Nucleic acid binder design. Structure first.
Ligand SMILES: [K+]
Ligand SMILES: [K+]
Ligand SMILES: [K+]
Ligand SMILES: [K+]
Ligand SMILES: [K+]
Ligand SMILES: [K+]
Ligand SMILES: [K+]
Ligand SMILES: [Mg+2]
Ligand SMILES: [Mg+2]
Ligand SMILES: [Mg+2]
Ligand SMILES: [Mg+2]
Ligand SMILES: [Mg+2]
Ligand SMILES: [Mg+2]
Ligand SMILES: [Mg+2]
Ligand SMILES: [Mg+2]
Ligand SMILES: [Mg+2]
Ligand SMILES: [Mg+2]
Ligand SMILES: [Mg+2]
Ligand SMILES: [Mg+2]
Ligand SMILES: [Mg+2]
Ligand SMILES: [Mg+2]
Ligand SMILES: [Mg+2]
Ligand SMILES: [Mg+2]
Ligand SMILES: [Mg+2]
Ligand SMILES: [Mg+2]
Ligand SMILES: [Mg+2]
Ligand SMILES: [Mg+2]
Ligand SMILES: [Mg+2]
Ligand SMILES: [Mg+2]
Ligand SMILES: [Mg+2]
Ligand SMILES: [Mg+2]
Ligand SMILES: [Mg+2]
Ligand SMILES: [Mg+2]
Ligand SMILES: [Mg+2]
Lengths: 51, 136, 177, 78, 116
RNA sequence: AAAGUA
RNA sequence: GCGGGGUGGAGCAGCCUGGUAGCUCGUCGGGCUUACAACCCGAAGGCGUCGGUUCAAAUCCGGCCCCCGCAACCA
RNA sequence: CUUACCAACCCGAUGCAAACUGCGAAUACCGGAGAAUGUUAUCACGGGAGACACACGGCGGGUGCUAACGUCCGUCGUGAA
RNA sequence: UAACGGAGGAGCACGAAGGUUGGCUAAUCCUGGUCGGACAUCAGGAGGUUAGUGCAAUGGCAUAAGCCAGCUUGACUGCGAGCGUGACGGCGCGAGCAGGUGCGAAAGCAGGUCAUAGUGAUCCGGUGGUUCUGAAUGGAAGGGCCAUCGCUCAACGGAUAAA
RNA sequence: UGCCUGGCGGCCGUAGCGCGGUGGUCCCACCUGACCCCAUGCCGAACUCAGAAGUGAAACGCCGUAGCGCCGAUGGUAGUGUGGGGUCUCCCCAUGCGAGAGUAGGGAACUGCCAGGCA
């Protein structure tokens, strides 16, 4: 179990987050994906942060 | 002593031994020793009968063995209790059903083949009978 | 394009007579010419391949394609997917111009040249030959080489047998022996 | 001594749940399988674990079709 | 073989269309001609058809194997379909790229009224 | 400072 | 039964964890000496046995053999 | 050149397999329809339990030695009662 | 569907190895070919999946589920007809509906990965959010609700924080 | 109406291979060019576009031919449900179901919709 948990934080300022895992040794760059924010009800950018 | 050079698995279920044999014709020579009863033939028995056969014809002619001992038999050692896994493979057998041609001979007179097969049958745990090739 | 005109205006009737073809589409054609460099030395220095391709680009006037190992081989210390070669496929006009530069210029410049073998046919009318040194091609300045390099040359022909493939190549005066 | 064996996994209860001619409601599982021993025909879906389920109400029908003699399950509207 | 390669390319979309029970607009393209067929969902009955091997269509064309002929077949098959009141079909490129002549036929059938 | 034997 | 082993002539590293393996002594050649030894220089020499896995095994796995160390008990 | 020779591949012939299958039953099981028969024998909900040491016999098997009044499953019968 | 019956594996991996659109087809051998060899890259032929599948085995896979590339975040949020499987706690399959999204000309496909292992109840607490609560009242503390975190509790339905 | 060809299906080897022959008006194929729309991890090979001089060589279609694949009885045999029996590891009897393999033999597919050419 080398993959660590991380949270993807909404950029819409709602506080909503997704969680996932990441191999931080092979891919140290920050994960960035567009995901649906159910608070504002739009797809926005989500950015990696600590669990 | 015949024995498979290698096998997929080391040990085998006991199974049963019902039915009549396949391979009931003299197919390679002119004379055969055919099983009348049912049983197991160990590799030592097959070889003891081969030796007796071969010495009787003075190593003339040709001899086929139609059965091969491919079934491993396990035994539990002495003073061991029941359980703790299947025992160790100790010898190999061929399952014999009635009608199975066990050996065949060619290149010798019929009278000598009868005598050689009689000496061999005396080494085997199963009742046997002398057979000859048929045209159909 | 000169050798292509040579094919359509004289080689066809020569071969139409020698083999008594009823249809003209039966006449063997030169389908393609493929040059290959087995650069098995690139696994230690990838820059060696970058020069080998540079030569093949100059020799053929076409960007070469780097080739990769189809499977891992322990004998040659290669893993599947290693770039270990480069090839170029010539067709049409670029084929014929190289075919001309090869017969009439490059081949007569071969070290101790005494004619190409006529037993280098694969059995279905295709011819393969190996060039030991890349300097024979005038597009290669003898002074700027860092390492002498060979290559393979395959002429893929729509012939059906070895005799028809040698007949076709002979009609261009292929310097056989 | 001891044995190096003694392991197994729980049985997965695969197999045919509704046989030929049975009337089913939409959504009903018809067969559970590893891979597509049976293939989905008309009004039948194939789930992510290759479960075949009814997409309409009707009667189950098995048939062999196609160039590979493959077995298909379909639902006949009743 | 070129034809078997194309038939393989076409099978997945054709099996999907059969599963959906759609009415197909099937296109066939050769170097010299182009053909269009509107086929019933059962796949074995042709409802309408048009191609450049028909006299009434090919007489108005300079050459039957270019984009202009493709556009003429596309328009023709759509007017004959709408005359039978069909309207809604699915396009089956039959393993050809959606491009050039095949695309020009599709665009003309869309313009003339067919919905896909 | 270290040098055994015939 | 549970462990640990097995590698140049000898004693011993590396094994773990996949990509030609070392050291001490010994041996061989040369040197120093009247000669030998000591000393000095230079060189050479090899994964217990199969099978398997692997593109590749001294190495991982499963057998087999030889060695060692514990245990083989209560009536 | 020659084999005491060994011979893979392929071709022909012969067997064997719980963890082989280009074939494949009987039964069993699921569903539908129909008659006759059966004190509803079926299902649901609620009050009260006992029981969770089984035994032998037949058939199909693992284990054991196709040893055991042995052992462990499947299924039917009887004992248990 | 049992045995201290016969054999093997897991306690993960992956922002692509996921989605989609378009394309593609294996092993092995034979012949010819510079270095080049049993085996490298090239060409042709035979062959027809004997390959491949991130990792065991089985069932699958060509319309590929196998191989390559472009664009991407559906590895979406709220729900869910119906069904499977469990004594139960639970676990699984699922069309379709609303919102918002990616790929495609379009029909369409997408709620992770060919499928089946990759796991841990409750309590007690931690962090963020919140139109809930707030012991005279306004607040606050604490609590609830939503998201999430801490156990080789591996004797893996987990007697205790501690033998 | 008959012949030939193209497309989409049914069917899924009695339908597939092999061998031999045969067809170009049309259709199909190869084919001819490529500045282009588009394309090659190189190549107009493929994909694509613009065409119509050549050829049915390859491919494809059609015809023929049992060297194969494939299909395949009848009879017997194996197994087996129920009841009964024996010398009971294995069998037999009554009744019901009845293979697989092999044998005789069959066999060079059949067919629907639309379109084009020719008579
Ligand atoms: K050729
Ligand atoms: K019993
Ligand atoms: K992808
Ligand atoms: K992709
Ligand atoms: K108070
Ligand atoms: K416990
Ligand atoms: K045939
Ligand atoms: Mg049995
Ligand atoms: Mg299981
Ligand atoms: Mg002394
Ligand atoms: Mg002295
Ligand atoms: Mg019933
Ligand atoms: Mg109890
Ligand atoms: Mg009990
Ligand atoms: Mg019991
Ligand atoms: Mg019994
Ligand atoms: Mg027993
Ligand atoms: Mg007992
Ligand atoms: Mg007993
Ligand atoms: Mg009692
Ligand atoms: Mg039970
Ligand atoms: Mg039980
Ligand atoms: Mg695709
Ligand atoms: Mg995929
Ligand atoms: Mg995948
Ligand atoms: Mg998987
Ligand atoms: Mg507390
Ligand atoms: Mg709060
Ligand atoms: Mg207050
Ligand atoms: Mg427990
Ligand atoms: Mg072309
Ligand atoms: Mg021809
Ligand atoms: Mg039969
Ligand atoms: Mg034929």
């Amino acid at each position: 179990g080398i993959r660590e948990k991380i949270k993807l934080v909404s950029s819409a300022g709602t506080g909503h987050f997704y969680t996932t895992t990441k191999n931080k040794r092979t891919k140290p760059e920050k994960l960035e994906l567009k995901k649906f924010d159910p608070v504002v009800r739009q797809h926005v950018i989500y950015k990696e942060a600590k669990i | 002593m015949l024995q498979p050079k290698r096998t997929k698995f080391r040990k085998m279920h006991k199974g049963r031994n019902r039915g009549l044999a396949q391979g009931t014709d003299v197919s390679f020579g002119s004379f055969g020793l055919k099983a009348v009863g049912r049983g197991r033939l160990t590799a030592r028995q097959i070889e003891a009968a081969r030796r007796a056969m071969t010495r009787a014809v003075k190593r003339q002619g040709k001899i086929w063995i139609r059965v091969f001992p491919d079934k491993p038999i396990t035994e539990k050692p002495l003073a061991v209790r029941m359980g703790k896994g299947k025992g160790n493979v100790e010898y190999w057998v061929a399952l014999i059903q009635p009608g199975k041609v066990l050996y065949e001979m060619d290149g010798v007179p019929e009278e000598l083949a009868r005598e050689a097969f009689k000496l061999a049958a005396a080494k085997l745990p199963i009742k046997t009978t002398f057979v000859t090739k048929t045209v159909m | 394009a000169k050798l292509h005109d040579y094919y359509k205006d004289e080689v066809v009737k020569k071969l139409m007579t020698e083999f008594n073809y009823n249809s003209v589409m039966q006449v063997p054609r030169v389908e393609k010419i493929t040059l290959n460099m087995g650069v098995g030395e690139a696994i230690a220095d990838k820059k060696l391949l970058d020069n080998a391709a540079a030569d093949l680009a100059a020799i053929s006037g076409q960007k070469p394609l780097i080739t990769k190992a189809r499977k891992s081989v322990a004998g040659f210390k290669i893993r599947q997917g290693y770039p270990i070669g480069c090839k170029v496929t010539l067709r049409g006009e670029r084929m014929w111009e190289f075919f001309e530069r090869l017969i009439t210029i490059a081949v007569p410049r071969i070290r101790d040249f005494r004619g190409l073998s006529a037993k280098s046919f694969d059995g279905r009318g295709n011819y393969s030959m190996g060039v030991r040194e890349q300097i024979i091609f005038p597009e290669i300045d003898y002074d700027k080489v860092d390492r002498v390099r060979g290559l393979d040359i395959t002429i893929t022909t729509t012939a059906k047998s070895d005799e028809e493939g040698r007949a076709l190549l002979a009609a261009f005066d292929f310097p056989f022996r | 001594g001891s044995t190096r064996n003694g392991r197994d996994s729980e049985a997965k209860r695969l197999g045919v749940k509704r046989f030929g001619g049975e009337s089913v409601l939409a959504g009903s599982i018809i067969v559970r399988q590893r891979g597509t021993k049976f293939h989905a025909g008309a009004n039948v879906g194939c789930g992510r674990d290759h479960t075949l389920f009814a997409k309409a109400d009707g009667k189950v029908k098995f048939e062999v079709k196609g160039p590979k003699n493959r077995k298909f399950i379909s639902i006949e509207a009743e | 073989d070129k034809k078997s390669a194309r038939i393989r390319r076409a099978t997945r979309a054709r099996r999907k269309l059969q599963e959906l029970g759609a009415t197909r607009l099937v296109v066939h393209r050769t170097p010299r001609h182009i053909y269009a067929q509107v086929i019933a969902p059962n796949g074995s009955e042709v409802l309408v058809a048009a191609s450049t091997v028909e006299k009434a269509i090919a007489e108005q064309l300079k050459y039957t194997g270019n984009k202009d002929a493709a556009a003429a077949v596309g328009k023709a098959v759509a007017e004959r379909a709408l005359e039978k009141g069909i309207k809604d079909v699915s396009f089956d490129r039959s393993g050809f790229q959606y491009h050039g002549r095949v695309q020009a036929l599709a665009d003309a059938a869309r313009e003339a009224g067919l919905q896909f």
